[PDB]
Design an enzyme around this catalytic site. Structure first.
Site, mmCIF file in Angstrom:
data_model
loop_
_atom_site.group_PDB
_atom_site.id
_atom_site.type_symbol
_atom_site.label_atom_id
_atom_site.label_comp_id
_atom_site.label_asym_id
_atom_site.label_seq_id
_atom_site.Cartn_x
_atom_site.Cartn_y
_atom_site.Cartn_z
ATOM 1 N N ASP A 1 0.849 -1.172 0.000
ATOM 2 C CA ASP A 1 0.000 0.000 0.000
ATOM 3 C C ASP A 1 0.897 1.239 0.000
ATOM 4 O O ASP A 1 2.099 1.073 0.215
ATOM 5 C CB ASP A 1 -0.704 0.216 1.358
ATOM 6 C CG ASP A 1 -1.516 -0.989 1.676
ATOM 7 O OD1 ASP A 1 -2.062 -1.539 0.678
ATOM 8 O OD2 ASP A 1 -1.602 -1.388 2.860
ATOM 9 N N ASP B 1 -2.045 -2.699 -4.326
ATOM 10 C CA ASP B 1 -3.016 -3.095 -3.314
ATOM 11 C C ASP B 1 -3.753 -1.852 -2.837
ATOM 12 O O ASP B 1 -4.384 -1.220 -3.692
ATOM 13 C CB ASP B 1 -2.398 -3.921 -2.201
ATOM 14 C CG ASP B 1 -3.465 -4.779 -1.559
ATOM 15 O OD1 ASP B 1 -4.368 -5.384 -2.152
ATOM 16 O OD2 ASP B 1 -3.421 -4.885 -0.333
ATOM 17 N N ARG C 1 -13.853 0.340 -2.587
ATOM 18 C CA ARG C 1 -13.320 0.442 -1.235
ATOM 19 C C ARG C 1 -12.940 1.880 -0.909
ATOM 20 O O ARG C 1 -11.773 2.180 -0.646
ATOM 21 C CB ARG C 1 -12.094 -0.443 -1.050
ATOM 22 C CG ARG C 1 -12.264 -1.935 -1.296
ATOM 23 C CD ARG C 1 -10.904 -2.570 -1.022
ATOM 24 N NE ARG C 1 -10.883 -4.006 -1.244
ATOM 25 C CZ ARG C 1 -9.801 -4.732 -0.955
ATOM 26 N NH1 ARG C 1 -8.709 -4.156 -0.466
ATOM 27 N NH2 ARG C 1 -9.833 -6.036 -1.171
HETATM 28 CA CA LIG Z 1 -3.285 -3.636 2.126
#
Ligand SMILES: [Ca+2]
Length: 399
Positions: free
Chosen positions: A184, A223, A279
């Site tokens: 991330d 990600d 998300r």
């Molecule tokens: Ca993650």
């Protein structure tokens, strides 16, 4: 107080709870650093035991995929000698391997390759730390900041392309399996009292549209942008600009992680989400206050088409106020996505394409999330959100 010495306001979201978020504002003059490369950044942060209040100014672009001499590192530099994507694909093909986690030679070689890259791009941020961008062009490229500590402030930085060269095939992930990557831009793993403000997050010069498909699934190298897991708590994310990315923010990593109940207290306000697929955020368990955010995209985009904004996961308690969503042709119900165990959502003042809607009621959910926000600043009227957020969100707007 200059940017490095500023602290989170006493009523500004869940981050202000108890001891609040002061980062490294009390740092002495010898613990104030200016860093312009990976070596300097790693040295200034020190180890996890370096809890001395510290202020770190980022100057220019910091590329994290570099060796100790600051030379760029590519796939071949990290690749284990025995790893070969062609061999990996043949070994774990669902038609011969079936739906079970990969294991054996090629997966072991892939995992070793991934650990080589992880050693360069992931950096742990110690407690009582303020990391701020100097000027208007501070950038972190390829890196993954991990926060497991307390009292951290991250402001005015553009984070780009946290790219994983060795995604893992997971055939049990979802109905048809998926390729999963590890990095991330910012990973909050049990971290507490954190303020992420005026940052920009994107996929840099390597958007997902350039990725091939293997086994019918996208070979995903990215990600999340700002994820929170394992008991993370008391966090305020404000005035950030998230754009051109698929999975933005997942708060609560698993339905089985019942220890997250009572935690994941995060306040998201005045953030901008442009061309974000999903998300934003996807929540499990937490009391998450979502207000004055602006979401814009298209369902027919060729790179990052909008799928949903809020993900209603197991025992999630999203309390949303005066948020604006501009996605032409979208129906009111499709602003959110309901997952296993998701039963409630409170949303008031939601505007979809200029029209007042009730996202919770459109999905037949309960409006009782069981809590009321106690720590927040002034809430803007929905009509003023788009202008306020577009003009103020993101890195380079302060200095
Ligand atoms: Ca993650």
């Amino acid at each position: 107080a200059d940017l490095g010495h500023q602290t989170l306001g006493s009523n500004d979201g869940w981050g202000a709870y108890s001891t609040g978020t002061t980062g490294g504002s009390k740092a002495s003059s010898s613990n104030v650093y200016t860093v312009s490369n990976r070596n300097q950044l790693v040295s200034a942060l020190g180890k996890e035991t370096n809890t001395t209040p510290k202020i770190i100014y980022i100057k220019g672009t910091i590329d994290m995929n570099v060796d100790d001499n600051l030379k760029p590192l590519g796939l071949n530099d990290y690749k284990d000698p025995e790893y070969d994507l062609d061999k990996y694909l043949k070994a774990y093909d669902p038609s011969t391997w079936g739906k079970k986690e990969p294991s054996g030679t090629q997966e072991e070689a892939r995992a070793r390759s991934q650990k080589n890259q992880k050693a360069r791009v992931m950096v742990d941020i110690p407690a009582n730390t303020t990391i701020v961008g100097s000027g208007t062009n501070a950038k972190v490229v390829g890196g993954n900041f991990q926060i497991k500590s307390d009292n951290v402030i991250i402001r005015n930085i553009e984070f780009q392309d946290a790219y994983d060269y060795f995604p893992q095939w997971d055939p049990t992930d979802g109905s048809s399996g998926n390729w999963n990557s590890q990095y991330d831009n910012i990973t909050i793993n049990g971290g507490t009292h954190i303020w992420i403000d005026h940052c920009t997050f994107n996929d840099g010069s390597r958007p997902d549209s350039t990725s091939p498909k293997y086994y019918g699934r996208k070979y995903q190298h990215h990600d999340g942008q700002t994820d929170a897991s394992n008991g993370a708590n008391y966090i305020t994310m404000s005035y950030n600009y998230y754009h051109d990315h698929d999975k933005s923010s997942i708060f609560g990593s698993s339905d089985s992680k019942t220890s997250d109940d009572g935690k994941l207290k995060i306040t998201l306000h005045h953030n901008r989400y442009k061309n974000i697929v999903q998300r934003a955020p996807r929540v499990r368990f937490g009391q998450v206050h979502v207000y004055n955010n602006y979401y814009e995209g298209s369902t027919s985009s060729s790179s990052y088409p909008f799928s949903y904004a809020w993900g209603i996961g197991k025992s999630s308690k999203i309390y949303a106020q005066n948020n604006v969503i501009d996605v032409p042709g979208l129906s009111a119900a499709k602003t959110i996505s309901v997952f296993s165990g998701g039963t409630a959502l409170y949303d008031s003042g939601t505007l979809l394409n200029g029209t007042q809607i009730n996202a919770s009621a459109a999905n037949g959910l309960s409006s009782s999330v069981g809590w009321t926000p106690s720590l927040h600043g002034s809430i803007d009227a929905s009509a003023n959100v788009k202008s306020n957020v577009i003009n103020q969100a993101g890195a380079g707007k302060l200095n």
